[model samples]
Target: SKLGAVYTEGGFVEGVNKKLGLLGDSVDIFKGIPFAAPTKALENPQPHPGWQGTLKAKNFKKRCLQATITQDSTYGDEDCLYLNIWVPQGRKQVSRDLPVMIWIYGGAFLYLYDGEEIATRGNVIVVTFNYRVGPLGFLSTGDANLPGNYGLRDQHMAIAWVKRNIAAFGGDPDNITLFGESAGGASVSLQTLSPYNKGLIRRAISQSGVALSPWVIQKNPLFWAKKVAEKVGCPVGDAARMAQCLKVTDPRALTLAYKYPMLHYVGFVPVIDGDFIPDDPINLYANAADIDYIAGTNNMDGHIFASIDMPAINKGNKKVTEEDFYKLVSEFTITKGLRGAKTTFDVYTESWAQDPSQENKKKTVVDFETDVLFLVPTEIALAQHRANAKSAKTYAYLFSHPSRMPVYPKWVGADHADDIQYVFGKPFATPTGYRPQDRTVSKAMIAYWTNFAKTGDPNMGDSAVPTHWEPYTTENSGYLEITKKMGSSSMKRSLRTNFLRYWTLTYLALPTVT
Candidate 1:
């Protein structure tokens, strides 16, 4: 039977979070709740019109039309603007207001998540939803008609939906935490800066991604628009005239255009069109004062560096010598590491002594790339957040929980989205395989995160959790190290500062994006 709900005098819905014993408790799971209308014809997201009918939310109807994630290469649509709500169950009626945690998923901004595992564990309302992706989500003429960031626009509408309707679901409208991983994390970072999201969000948590990542801001959206447009026979030249022409394109055709025939090019990704993401997003964070925040990345988050078959991506650059080192660093930096790349290389490779042997050289390259791409930029952004934000209640972390996934070697230590499974309490709930140690990490994260959403401080109420998650500041630069070290988890440690100083002082293209 499908889940059912009836709104109170106000637009509230009373629903039950079903049973899943090991996840700790059952949660009122609301599936495929339409938060917006598919304005695909209008090429935008339209807010849902209020309905006076029973809410029968059975399953996730359709995620934003993109390539299916499974064996079947089919299944997608333009009508992918729906959100799911998971409320903790057990207390029959009337209790204090519960905190809310809304998740934005990460699939290169291509796919979304719908599972209710994470929401069920924490004593908070969890909202997970779908938004536009690929071309439908991120078409930009660099002008007003199709200014870009339609994906972001969809998410913005969803936030409004949560604000208006979440109260009915036993979640607080005033207390909301915007959280996510990868592109989703990037979305949260941008939302915190978006003029439209000023009062809508209370706290934010960005895992393994930030808006400052070099890839966030599209450099020549016009070039990308032109290529994708020409492939589908849309107007190529003018930004003003191109929007409508691109609009008329078949949604799938536009999405498929992401695989442009260009030798070296880009995708239908988001951009800084001077509106949603203003000029130099870094400056936006610099000027924005006093916001609660938490940001982090995994240790050795260079997952891309590992290929189960790692023979190529280095055939051309034979030896990892000084010249070769500079060449590789520059490539990753998009030729932005012009003058200071040598120094940057020195600092990363321990002044070239770390890259003497070929095998050692490979490890050095992969590890250094992770530092520049993930860690350095995160440090810079958190630094900016501390500098500009009021009271600066900032927190940073490094996840070193190595998962026994068997997909890669042991050296890939906590690479990429390993923490996400723990964040969602995967060890206890996942069907197939999850280790015992993972449960430790999962339980620890659940405690810290839910606590943070409840109060501005993650360390406030839970003595069972960390005693002190020291607020990150310039003086101490504290960060919590999240790992499965038996009992010594989520512990705060001191930053040496020099790990970031080299990039701050020497790199031509600093990790913090423009």
Candidate 2:
């Protein structure tokens, strides 16, 4: 084997800290390693085409083709199925088996992530990969031929690759944990539910997103597919031809087809494919896997996510008033309604400075968005964990660590992706870069995360920050509110449980919703 190349996958293989570098020692970095054959269009992943000689494990693979407003027009191509592996090296190459952490990046399932400074801190083998995205990866004509979830299947194939090949890179295939943020977090939850990945994943960490989030699953996939076929000038009527034309058609063109359309929360994302995803996410997760899970979200997750709609909501008016909110939401309730609107408003409107106007206007909006999109789904997922899974080895957290980014209004305390900073050891921690608190928070998170990977529990004794990061339960919904400070950490109850219950009751009772 060459310097970085490790023999496995039945053959010889070869294959980031934000702006500033980490202070830690080096790890063996293998980049652009092929985990599977190039997955195109809607096909399931095929095995890697045979490699005859030494393969160069250098540059990262081109990102999987995707279409997002934030996407670089020329950065990626279709033959972009690849992954990177980081094996612990330097003063500490392990003699015994090492735990493995696999990262599934989240660009709302439309972007890619280059991951693994955490590998250095954790002393674990970390893997991050490019999976299919956008129309090429997820569009479904609603049939068996091009059944949706090509992107999801790609992740499954990568997991299978890790199981078969990670041992050579010093990864313990038997002890693997899937962890990710946003869509990536949602993907981790979905991976647990996948029958294709039953025994492969022993643990999961869901940060800020869950499979049950409305944006994670496509509700009207076929309709969108038809829109694509017609707009891109393909045979719109025949599903077979629609998919075939898309399959062989220029991937860039297919991606660009829907590039300008008014998309849902996430443009191209996962779907409820009966195969990989047999049924609804909650049911599948509860009944399927008996695994360790760490699920949590930020204090004001909706701050960033809801920002997308804030401009429009406050458009004509110079500033939004409480009346305008009710006016728009009143119409929204009759049309695109959220369940238990009365209870939702009443609960979230629990005043913060005792100023009803500011509380309802500013606080209510962020709180409502936070709960409905992220927190609610996460709580429900935990609820399922309690009701269904044989083992209740689950942990929940609330990341209240404020962002260092000066650009954000003070309202953005631990907004949507704030937790990622600590997890990754603070590269592009917040817009303004790492801080003193970040050091402490990052220490706690890295220790908690890597400790969980090492022993299936993050209880690394009382010396650690947030000393007892314990398991969550249905009886005591107490979760560790993760912060930069130590004594500040508290075991808190789930806010407004009965109101949350009202939400579930109203949702389950509604025939008008998905």
Candidate 3:
């Protein structure tokens, strides 16, 4: 039977009852819930006017306007600010006090995510939504004329809506947890920093990305904004005039226009707008000490580095050569001056000197990428969260479960986005697509995640899961190793500590090339 009517700021709504195939377990899902009004290009999101009749929120609406790269350069719609909610059903119903987990998806600010499985498996109400991405979402002219981060503002609006109206869907409005991956992960971090979300979010989980990650925040928004305007035949002179021209231009052309180089290029990302983001994102973490937080990354979260640096290795066409390994090390260490570069190169290639095999060189390259790109920033953020925390619990984890899918290189070893499938329980949802161990990993992840959402502690779950996840403190800097084996052994420490120090401490103190 379908779920009965519910009301929100947008008016009456109804949803579908989905069976989970286990002992009559089911979920009531409401899709395309209009949390905000249809926003125009380049403008801030506005609240949705209450609807006339019962809104049939059964199927997903169009995603926010973003470049559909695989679709011959097509684009999603601009009138997309809809959110979906999944309320667990057919159990010892907690009724209106169920925990709420809102997911902010990541694709360098250009992707969409699903939340059904996490809702069902975790016994928590899950919300996923569409926000503007790419130029339409985050183009700025470096002034008050057209500040960027409309996408983040869209996310803020959706979260506020959830805070106000989720209780109507049998969710505890006060017990909301915000979580995301990559760019979305960064969004969670940035939101925690924003004064706009001071009391709006109770907890947050940033996976594989944070505001401190070099690639997440764009420093030259004006450069990219003008490039888009130039490509789309808009005026580049005045900020106000350029914004007007841009707003009237073809959105698909705007989406297709911007050009960026391959080396760590993040176009149209979040900017340090004075109001939303407030101070520098780095300085804002201390202000979020009141919120419970969980942040982590996959062991080899830098497979993107493999794709970019040694493409052949990523494609499984060939292994990394000694020549390419040295070349990459020199390029990355260039900023640390010649002497420092030479010293750092030797430090990374000490293993390559002993075992100059292609496999060993590839491992070094992936390790370098993983440390610089993901691990260091994650560790720094966790440390800051712990140091500044008043009573809030801070936790961290390292996901090392390799994907069973054959598309990835065998050596990639739990690379970028590998943790997402497990976090969302995609394995159990599509059981035939994954191994039995995959299901086990997914179950454990869901248990730990929902437990943290329910109580500020991950170890306090109702399940007999036998892992005591200790709060990450200065003394016990250990992180939970989320993998196939879920027990005491999973609670180990020293995740590339020396390599982390080299980047976060040593490299920064080194003399610059200039």
Question: In TM-score terms, which candidate is top?
Answer: 3
TM agreement with the true structure for every prediction = 0.87, 0.88, 0.94
Which regions in candidate 2 have their CA more than 4 angstroms from the true location? 1-4, 14-25, 68-74, 90-96, 109-116, 260-267, 286-288, 312-317, 327-354, 405-412, 427-432, 461-463, 506-514
Model 3 score (lDDT): 0.82
Ranking by lDDT: 3, 2, 1
- Model 1 ranges off by over 4 Å: 1-4, 8-17, 20-25, 68-74, 91-96, 109-117, 260-266, 286-290, 305-324, 333-338, 351-355, 405-412, 486-499, 509-514
TM-score comparison, 1 vs 2, better candidate: 2
- Worst window of 10 by summed lDDT in candidate 1: 305-314
Instruction: Report the candidate with higher lDDT, 1 versus 3.
Output: 3
Give the alpha-carbon lDDT of every model. Answer: 0.70, 0.71, 0.82
Kindly list the per-residue Cα lDDT of model 3 for residues 1-514, writing each as its tens digit: 3358998877899988877776767888888998888888889999888979899998889987766657348656877899999988765553568889999998854234567787776778999998888888899986788898999999999999999999988889888999999888999999898999878888999999888887777778888889989989988888889988998898888888864213446678889888898878878877688889999998888766666777765544577776676677677666666777677787788887678766677677777777767888899999988888986899999998877553445463687888888888888778999999888888888898999998888877545455888889988888998888788888988788887787777777877767
Evaluated against the true structure, the overall lDDT of model 1 is 0.70
The weakest ten consecutive residues by lDDT in model 2 span 16-25
Model 2 whole-model lDDT (C-alpha atoms): 0.71
In angstroms, give how far residue 179 of model 1 lies from its true place. 0.7
Candidate 1 C-alpha lDDT tens digits along 3-90: 2464633243435546656534456677777788865732667766766656567677677766555523435667778777777665
